[PDB]
Design a protein around this nucleic acid. Structure first.
Lengths: 186, 117, 127
RNA sequence: AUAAACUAUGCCGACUAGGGAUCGGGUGGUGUUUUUUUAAUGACCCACUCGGCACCUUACGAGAAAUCAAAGUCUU
């Protein structure tokens, strides 16, 4: 539906499926009715996970408007389960964050709240992706030359949901952010 | 209180957004109205007069000289009523340069008048 | 109390012990920038990966000679009769030299802003 | 308010360090011992951590030398 979107202009084949897909679940399942009633979308992006296996395994990340971010997290688990069953693709939900500029301030009487800074915004996604479960340990490494590796500590009891998305996440992050992100289970 | 606006952290949570929501949490909560709900109650009241981060320095620092005023021998008391002081002043400025008028308070009956309600 | 020799005097203060570099100041567009012109001409390794309060941006691996000490300097003039003259700071004419000046335009190097005939402040000087 | 008012050694900003030495937290603890028909706890100890304690020490840097992990410290 153009309903469950904010720009409401035109959707992409991916964005379209997602729209009806969502509208589907609130009609089909009575429990997601309440939460999905609320949920609005901002935009959706598809990414291809290209491995050396010449295998094409894609997944899609959806941007939930910040207004419905509360709600999105409220049922996050069940939502993603059904969306993956109903789209046969890997699903990730993020918040639509707007980044502010560092030196491009223009409103004399306006301070750039840290809440929307590049460090904090880009650091956000990681929490968002592994979503259902939040990480235990986060770390940075400096390879000699000058690389920065983010080996992140993930909870053991979540090996299920997280082990699979594991590669997608890495790849989406490298695309949005620019950060290599290896995980480690503890 | 507002320093102790977050004795909520004790039995409610979670420091504290709610007032925004970033690295959020996992528990009941009924949103901004859950906050404001009793977060407005809080100090059995409200405030704003000015200005906590001083409305304390000036206090501890106020009574802080009753002894000085009577004892008068605890020079090892003046040696601090000077400091709690240079402090109670050192604040002012960042308000004498911003939040508190442009003289008084930023100068106030400081040294002295037990203020004020 | 002075982010310059602060950290260049840790690289400096390090390679003399010999090692694999360490942490430093907090970041500074400038710190990072010198800790650029360095790498870009050689000397250092790979500026690094920290992010905190202002602790952010980088550590920075060592590598190579880089001997000895990045130069900190604490005045600021430049151009023509100048630059050439404070090129006496240098560890010898016949190449070697590098004087990481500050150039009206660009935080540049003894030559890197000898470039388009530039000048200004004297930020520092390497190897 | 003089001073047989002192590490004859500055520091707003810190390393060559260690080793040990002391007082915090956090671990293990294994050691004790409380609690007290058994403990847990509490203590004692033990190690181990990290806090920072001060010191002490020179496989380093000095300076003009005795000494210095500084006065080490950017052709001196």
């Amino acid at each position: 539906a153009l309903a469950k979107f904010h720009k409401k202009q035109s959707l992409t084949k991916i964005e379209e499926q997602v729209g009806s897909a969502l509208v589907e679940l609130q009609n089909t399942h009575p429990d997601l009715k309440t939460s999905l009633e609320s949920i609005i979308l901002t935009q959706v992006k598809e990414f291809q996970i290209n491995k050396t296996n010449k295998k094409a395994k894609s997944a899609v990340l959806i941007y939930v408007h910040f207004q419905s971010y509360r709600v999105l997290l409220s049922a996050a688990r069940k939502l993603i389960i059904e969306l993956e069953k109903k789209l046969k693709q890997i699903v990730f939900f993020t918040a639509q964050r707007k980044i502010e500029s560092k030196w491009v301030k223009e409103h004399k009487s306006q301070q750039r709240p840290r809440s929307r800074c590049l460090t904090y915004v880009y650091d956000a996604l990681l929490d968002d992706l592994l979503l259902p479960s939040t990480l235990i340990g986060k770390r940075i490494r400096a390879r000699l030359d000058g690389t920065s590796f983010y080996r992140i500590q993930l909870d053991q009891n979540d090996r299920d949901f997280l082990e699979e998305k594991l590669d997608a996440i890495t790849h989406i992050y490298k695309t949005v952010t620019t950060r290599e992100v290896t995980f480690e289970f503890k | 209180e507002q320093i102790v606006k977050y004795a909520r952290k004790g039995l409610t949570p979670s420091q504290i957004g709610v007032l925004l929501r970033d690295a959020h949490g996992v528990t009941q909560a009924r949103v901004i109205t859950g906050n404001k709900i009793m977060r407005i109650l809080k100090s059995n009241g409200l405030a704003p007069e000015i200005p906590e981060d001083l409305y304390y320095l000036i206090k501890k620092a106020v009574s802080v000289r009753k002894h000085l005023e009577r004892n008068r021998k605890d020079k090892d008391a003046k040696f601090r009523l000077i400091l709690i002081e240079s402090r109670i002043h050192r604040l002012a400025r960042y308000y004498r340069t911003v939040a508190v008028l442009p003289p008084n308070w930023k100068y106030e009956s400081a040294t002295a008048s037990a203020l004020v309600n | 109390s002075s982010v310059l020799a602060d950290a260049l005097n840790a690289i400096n203060n390090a390679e003399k012990t010999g090692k694999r570099q360490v942490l430093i100041r907090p970041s500074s567009k400038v710190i990072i920038k010198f800790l650029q012109v360095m790498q870009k001409h050689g000397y250092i390794g790979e500026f690094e990966y920290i992010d905190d309060h202002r602790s952010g941006k980088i550590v920075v691996q060592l590598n190579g000679r880089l001997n000895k000490c990045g130069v900190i300097s604490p005045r600021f003039n430049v151009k023509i009769g100048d630059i050439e003259k404070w090129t006496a700071n240098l560890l010898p004419a016949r190449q070697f030299g590098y004087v990481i000046l500050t150039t009206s335009a660009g935080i540049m190097d003894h030559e890197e802003a000898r470039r388009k005939h530039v000048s200004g402040k004297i930020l520092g000087f390497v190897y």
